[PDB]
Amino acid sequence: STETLSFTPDNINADISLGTLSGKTKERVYLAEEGGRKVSQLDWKFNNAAIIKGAINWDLMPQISIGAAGWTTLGSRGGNMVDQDWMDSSNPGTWTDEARHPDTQLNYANEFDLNIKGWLLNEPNYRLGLMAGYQESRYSFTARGGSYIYSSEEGFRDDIGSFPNGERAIGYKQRFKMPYIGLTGSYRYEDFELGGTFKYSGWVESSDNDEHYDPKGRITYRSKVKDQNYYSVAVNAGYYVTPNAKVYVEGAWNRVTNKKGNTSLYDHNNNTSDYSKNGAGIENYNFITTAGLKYTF
Numbered sequence: 001s002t003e004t005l006s007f008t009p010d011n012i013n014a015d016i017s018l019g020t021l022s023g024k025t026k027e028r029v030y031l032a033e034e035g036g037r038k039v040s041q042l043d044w045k046f047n048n049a050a051i052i053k054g055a056i057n058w059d060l061m062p063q064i065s066i067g068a069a070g071w072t073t074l075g076s077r078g079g080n081m082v083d084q085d086w087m088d089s090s091n092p093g094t095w096t097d098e099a100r101h102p103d104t105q106l107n108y109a110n111e112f113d114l115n116i117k118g119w120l121l122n123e124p125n126y127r128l129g130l131m132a133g134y135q136e137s138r139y140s141f142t143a144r145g146g147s148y149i150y151s152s153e154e155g156f157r158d159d160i161g162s163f164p165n166g167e168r169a170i171g172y173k174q175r176f177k178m179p180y181i182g183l184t185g186s187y188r189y190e191d192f193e194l195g196g197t198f199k200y201s202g203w204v205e206s207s208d209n210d211e212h213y214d215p216k217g218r219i220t221y222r223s224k225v226k227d228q229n230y231y232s233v234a235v236n237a238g239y240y241v242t243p244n245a246k247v248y249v250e251g252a253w254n255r256v257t258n259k260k261g262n263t264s265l266y267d268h269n270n271n272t273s274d275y276s277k278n279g280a281g282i283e284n285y286n287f288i289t290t291a292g293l294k295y296t297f
């Protein structure tokens, strides 16, 4: 089993699949000089965005395998976005302004992953291995128009208006660099196979770019968070239609826990910039449902 000294650059298997990606990311702003309370929060979300997913696995030795994976959206997907503010420092906890944007879309999203697997168990009917790898994912959104419910000077959720259809918009990009460790495995009875994979990271580095388009309030925000936590849980079920062709179905969840980081503001109008330590926060989570084929050459 895992105690067999040999080399097999010959052992390779490919994995191609289709499915959907659903998720949500929360963009937060904090005021250091005010207890570090939350003052802004943008909630970008979207469901069933079609994606193509694939992997190439090299089972070089009984002890270790190398793998490269990736997925990307197959076109855009309309979503939703909500922007709230807590301008009342005497009542932080209840939002004072809420802007809704149904006209939002996930322009695109993708991810690649390179890893190594150290097999603890490697038999014909069951596999258990440690993992170590690196992943990078990107997201890009755009919100347009929408309605609001702001708070006047001496009022509260009174200034209930509406935005110019298509005007004032916002662009939001993100990047997640994730070095990680994991556990993967699968048991096989007859031609049926059940498997799972778990990932963890405490070294995540996320960064985002928020574009506020409006020849009036045209600002650019940039944030970066470090040593952020990441968790992932995936499970699959499949059948060996042929000795070396597995048809399978899979479900994956993953989360990036919120943490504070630094942010930089760029006001194009006044050509003024502003830096604020621990002024930003970033978090997200995703659900990936997929089905496909794993061919072992």
Ligand SMILES: CCCCCCCCO[C@@H]1O[C@H](CO)[C@@H](O)[C@H](O)[C@H]1O
Residues within 6 Å of the ligand: 074, 075, 076, 107
């Ligand atoms: C097999 C891969 C097919 C990829 C094609 C995806 C087509 C959907 O893609 C979408 O089409 C819209 C209409 O033109 C555009 O406005 C969007 O920007 C684009 O993302």
Ligand SMILES: CCCCCCCCO[C@@H]1O[C@H](CO)[C@@H](O)[C@H](O)[C@H]1O
Residues within 6 Å of the ligand: 052, 072, 073, 074, 075, 076, 107, 108
């Ligand atoms: C078989 C594999 C098909 C892959 C289809 C890829 C279609 C490319 O998709 C494109 O990705 C860009 C990201 O840079 C987006 O900005 C574009 O709006 C999107 O259409």
